[PDB]
Design an enzyme around this catalytic site. Sequence first.
Site, PDB file in Angstrom:
ATOM      1  CG  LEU A  31       6.269  21.456  13.731  1.00 26.22           C
ATOM      2  CD1 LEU A  31       6.841  22.458  12.466  1.00 26.22           C
ATOM      3  CD2 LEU A  31       6.609  19.886  13.817  1.00 26.22           C
ATOM      4  CB  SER A  33       6.108  23.699  23.363  1.00 26.39           C
ATOM      5  OG  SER A  33       5.183  24.020  24.401  1.00 26.39           O
ATOM      6  N   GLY A  34       7.382  26.552  24.193  1.00 24.02           N
ATOM      7  CA  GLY A  34       7.923  27.190  25.148  1.00 24.02           C
ATOM      8  C   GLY A  34       7.110  28.417  25.794  1.00 24.02           C
ATOM      9  CB  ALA A  35       8.133  30.979  28.144  1.00 25.29           C
ATOM     10  N   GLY A  37       5.679  30.735  23.058  1.00 24.92           N
ATOM     11  CA  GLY A  37       4.310  30.244  22.547  1.00 24.92           C
ATOM     12  C   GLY A  37       4.499  28.784  21.995  1.00 24.92           C
ATOM     13  CE  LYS A  58       8.604  32.647  17.009  1.00 26.74           C
ATOM     14  NZ  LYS A  58       9.753  33.041  16.486  1.00 26.74           N
ATOM     15  NE  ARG A 154      19.391  28.715  20.092  1.00 24.24           N
ATOM     16  CZ  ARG A 154      20.494  29.661  20.139  1.00 24.24           C
ATOM     17  NH1 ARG A 154      21.564  29.372  20.391  1.00 24.24           N
ATOM     18  NH2 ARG A 154      20.247  30.796  20.050  1.00 24.24           N
ATOM     19  CG  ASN A 155      17.363  30.804  15.841  1.00 24.41           C
ATOM     20  OD1 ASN A 155      16.305  30.198  16.357  1.00 24.41           O
ATOM     21  ND2 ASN A 155      18.196  31.579  16.698  1.00 24.41           N
TER      22      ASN A 155
END
Lengths: 293, 269
Positions: A31, A33-35, A37, A58, A154-155
């Site tokens: 769902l 992706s990024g730095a 995790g 997550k 976003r959250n």
Amino acid sequence: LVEPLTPSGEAPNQALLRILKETEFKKIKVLGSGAFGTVYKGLWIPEGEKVKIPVAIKELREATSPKANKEILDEAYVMASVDNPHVCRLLGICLTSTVQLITQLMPFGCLLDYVREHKDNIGSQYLLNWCVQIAKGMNYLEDRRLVHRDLAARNVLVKTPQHVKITDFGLAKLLGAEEKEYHAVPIKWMALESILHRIYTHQSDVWSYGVTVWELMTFGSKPYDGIPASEISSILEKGERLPQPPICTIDVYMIMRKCWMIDADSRPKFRELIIEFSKMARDPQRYLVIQGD
Amino acid sequence: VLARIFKETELRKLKVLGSGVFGTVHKGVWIPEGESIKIPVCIKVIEDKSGRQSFQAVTDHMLAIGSLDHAHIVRLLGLCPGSSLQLVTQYLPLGSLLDHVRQHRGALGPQLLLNWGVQIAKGMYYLEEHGMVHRNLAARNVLLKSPSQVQVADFGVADLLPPPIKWMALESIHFGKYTHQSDVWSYGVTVWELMTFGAEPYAGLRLAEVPDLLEKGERLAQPQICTIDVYMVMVKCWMIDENIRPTFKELANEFTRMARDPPRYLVIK
Ligand SMILES: Nc1ncnc2c1ncn2[C@@H]1O[C@H](COP(=O)(O)OP(=O)(O)NP(=O)(O)O)[C@@H](O)[C@H]1O
Ligand SMILES: Nc1ncnc2c1ncn2[C@@H]1O[C@H](COP(=O)(O)OP(=O)(O)O)[C@@H](O)[C@H]1O
Ligand SMILES: [Mg+2]
Ligand SMILES: [Mg+2]
């Protein structure tokens, strides 16, 4: 003998942190992706109990430092402590080489994505209700004395079009009965004092709230785009704020302008925001002009 | 600080107190050179499995164990070499912490539980600052000196023998790697024992692969009297990555901060 009684009173946090094993939940697809995790979609199958729970998993890159780890653990702490219809609660964690937070899946996912994809099917009475539910959730977070230092579209997750929740909590910090401020990040969502003096309060999350509502009323537009985060400070110093969304009336944009006031005490409270937006929600076509309705 | 050496004639074994993984503990007595006094002591006998006949002489590790003294560890009064190694300590009548918390249970003060956490962390910190690895920390190996004081016992005993599964860290189980951080894991399990009033770690499970489950992401469940704040500490103690785990001073300090306000972190009624 024994070391000082020094009591503060106050209630103990008896939130239960259920620990799950990796083999109790499956991973289906990605769902996010990024730095940080990776956020996965998957099926949780409990031990002996068998209802199948669509969950978000997550999972985060292993810890660099002794407490590089525990800001993750603080995130888990907060997500385990909160309990609210409009705040996403932790269902448990998996402790291995990489720590995995497990929450209930929200089928429609990110709200910022939702107000973009469904740009011309969203009505009055949905946007206003979303604002109301966010205000309620943030007010609960205010009652628990924890500040959501990263409130944005976003959250915010979407369970159903009629129900949204709040998440992240990666930067969230808990205020003691002692403290009234938190002194320590997304510049275009923070209040002025958070940029200049790194001061975080409940009224800072009100500024963030205003920016969130702005993202919703502009159907997922980017705040201050074209303007580098570089000293957006100064523009605020001039007194220039976010523009009025095309669908917003002068009263809605007044509340938006109200959340972005320099004086933190002049800004509205979440309780007030609930009252006002719930008021607007009883006649949404009057406060928002949408030709789809 | 100073290691005393005994002759086999200075020691005598009266009654068997119990046996564990490494040695056999006798309640015995000390009769020094030329005297007729019987001073009640605790003699633990470890059988020499070296093959090189190594316990006939005082080794460096023996001196390391005998050169330690702290308010919250069990001081080693003396050692006696020979075919069998005899470790002499004080006889603490109050017994182990495990049997005590099993006995009084909730009746004990939460202040006492937290402070005991602090004390155990204290002793382990003293042991770590002198490079001493315990390799067998548990609630059973914590003895009451006073009704308010606890002391760590059986430290350094493990590496007297040639190369407890429920108190060992993963690296210790898989590769026989023992560190102060493995003692941190063992500390976390010990505190779990403490605040669950003497519960058996992984009761329903069998040893055969407790390690599998630990690798699958499962830990010891949250204790019924434990707030999330206190359980988070045990959780961090049980981390797989070795330097993610807390240090003993950090542990002592945070259990001290909790000891400042006991009812906020432990709920017993
Ligand atoms: N100083 C002491 N005073 C009184 N009893 C002691 C003392 N040291 C050890 N014991 C007792 O010795 C008994 C068995 O000794 P021992 O087998 O070495 O420890 P253990 O309980 O089996 N734990 P371990 O052997 O390290 O796995 C226990 O019941 C202890 O209470
Ligand atoms: N329970 C969930 N249901 C659906 N999507 C989720 C869920 N949790 C996270 N996500 C996805 O991950 C993103 C939010 O993750 P978040 O908790 O904000 O982590 P971070 O901001 O640290 O990347 C959203 O875009 C959302 O699509
Ligand atoms: Mg985010
Ligand atoms: Mg023992």
